[PDB]
Amino acid sequence: KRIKGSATSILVGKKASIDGSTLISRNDDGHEALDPQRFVVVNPEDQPRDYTSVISKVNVKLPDDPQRYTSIPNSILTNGIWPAAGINSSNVAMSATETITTNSRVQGLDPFVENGLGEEDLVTVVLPYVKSAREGVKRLGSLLEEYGTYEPNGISFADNEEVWWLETIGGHHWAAVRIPDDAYVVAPNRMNIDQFDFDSDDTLCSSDLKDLIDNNNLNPDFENYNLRHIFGSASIKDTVYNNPRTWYGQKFFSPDDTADDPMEQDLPFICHANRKISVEDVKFVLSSHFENTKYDVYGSGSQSDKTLFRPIGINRNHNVHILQIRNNVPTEIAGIHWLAYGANTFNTVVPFYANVNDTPVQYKNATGKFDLNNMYWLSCTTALLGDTDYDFYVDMRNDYELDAMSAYRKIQNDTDADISGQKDIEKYLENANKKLADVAFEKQNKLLGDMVTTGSNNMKLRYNLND
């Protein structure tokens, strides 16, 4: 068999955010709980021109003018690079992938292509070569049509104006929708695009998609086109593995527009929140485990209720990224690659400037060797200890989140404030990223220390005299 990713994604249009930025985000989850991640800038000279994948052995000849981009490659390259997500020098963001679903009727017509492209590959072969989110969508579509794919995937694109979501369909087909400026999306591992207008300028797809549907009796609905009804799933597994994640996110942002059934199969794709959305909001949902419901594994529910649903924050979060393209700041500091590692319950995303040529050591240097000086291993260790007694550690966790995010914001604010006239912008921003990573490590380390100190007093292996 082939190794597969898992994920939860959240998208925010430029009018829906609290600061007028676009946000595309994803929990990059995997099969094993731990799989070391690195934060790496791929400079143009480092980018392949003759690309061959490890998993599928697909060979793609690439353009000769790649742009510099951030990425989050695996430390261990057994299954290839797995760059996950990044922002290029044109301030275009891309995250790939959100594994989605398919069905036997479309697979019968356009099967997966064994030697096609996969999540292993997509950012590497698309992001360096596009100058808008729309261009990203179109290039990826072209590559799917030409080379095919062996996975069902959802991919996000953004620039300072637009946010797009592309879903792959069978071995070669695809469709994509531009998320409205004022909207957000929460997307689990299930095909998401619903109502789809072939006549809209805000949609793109395989030229033959409508004919594929119309000519092969793929449409289950009496009227109109709902792509996930046609090409996706509405399974019993969806009701426990996927829909509750969508539901919990929509309950958080749109409480008065969202009913009380986490199993709902027709939750809207495009949503409108009752307020503007912050980075902190996005990280909360990306770290969640159905808090204040009977489905919280750390909560008061029955054993069966507590384990019924797949949470969003999860032991096998490998990285979490929130890619932000800001507006009303100079373009050279618009791109922010927010990043953290390990189960999202005990980390914080750090707002790294994407306009840099290299990355901080604590985030760049993970290998297969356990190293608590590295933020991947330190963050995972913290979350594991936290998992053993969540209610005991959660107050320290909460304090740390506020304290750390406050410190990051102060550094960002100071750095933004002095951008004008900097003679070496990349060096200036690399220094800012170094400060951010240093503080992130210090506060992560201090949190773990506080947890170890208090936790040790509460060990089972104890016997105290109460005097």
Add this chain to the structure above:
Amino acid sequence: KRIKGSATSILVGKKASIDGSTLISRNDDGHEALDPQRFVVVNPEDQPRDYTSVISKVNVKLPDDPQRYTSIPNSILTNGIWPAAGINSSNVAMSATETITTNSRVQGLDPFVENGLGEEDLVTVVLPYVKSAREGVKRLGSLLEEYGTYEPNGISFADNEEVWWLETIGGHHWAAVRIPDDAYVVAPNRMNIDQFDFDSDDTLCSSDLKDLIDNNNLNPDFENYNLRHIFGSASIKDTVYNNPRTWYGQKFFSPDDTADDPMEQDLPFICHANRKISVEDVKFVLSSHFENTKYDVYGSGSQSDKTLFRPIGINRNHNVHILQIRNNVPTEIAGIHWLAYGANTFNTVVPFYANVNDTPVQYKNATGKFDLNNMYWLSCTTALLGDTDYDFYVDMRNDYELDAMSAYRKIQNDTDADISGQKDIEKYLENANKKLADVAFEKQNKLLGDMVTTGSNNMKLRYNLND
């Protein structure tokens, strides 16, 4: 670390009270269950002109004309004075503080000031120098701008006309609301001020507050300004630690305007009760533990429900005070500093006249040495015993509350009735306060005795012949 206070506060406007008085109140809670408190009048000659805090080392030069004021300082000065609350000779009341919440976005712009002011300090540096509640608000606002603060705090002020609530925002900013005459407030450890009209005569704030919000994308709402949405929190921890306290209080006073969800994040700040409010009402809510719900730790709920919410009456109540400025009595007896010590389940507030130069021995003289002749230690001992079998002791508790409060009221009524023509008002009221404290001790001691006598008969270590 730095030690932090905790609290629950209740405010009542002059038209909302049963007697036309203003009331500002707070449970002064702390980290440890026990921390001995004293009732102390600071005469002008005792007041520092050159003040330095213990926790932050902030140094504040003070005016040379301080007014006399009541206060509730810590017996043990390890972390400074912690005066908590009092009434000055101009019949201005102040209670500080209700620790509240903040968020990373505003902290990123205006961080806490390490060597700034804190709860340790505020009553000492403000109350002696103001002649109205409004002046208190303005002086505190000025001091925050001058010295900064290292805590997020809520502070109440009152005189015979007005009640104000000030909340500190970041290291230097602040906002305050004059509570409508006919309104009340219940405030837990969460930022409270909601809808806020900068043009209102009922509001005061940092001169730059609206610009700070507008220019830095701090406002999450599509319309208007809600200060706690902007500057505060709505966290998962809020739903168990804070909101249920607000909810239980509002359920008590406004049953028909309050829904059934204790976790509600947008309970109103300003409320209107269905009736006029007594001192006895306020003490009840300040002593409460979600009686007649599954969230009552002394009740019938599951272990998880019983311990889910932070109660208002609690083991770490250090003092409880209700500062009352009465109307239509002569000004020399308008100020009443109601006071009790220890967990509020087994004490009663005593209506001490604030117009005095000294305080009764049973309330003034606590040290670190356990002394059951002192009301701090006696009250704490009583509440601890009560905690071991609440349903067994609650009838004696209830009887004592009625009996004791009736005795206090008789003494107050007689004292008020003979105020005219007194040649030495302070001596006259000090004598009344001595009578109050004497009877308060007698009734507290008799309660504990009755509990010990009946409790001893029900000890586990027993074996009786039933004849």
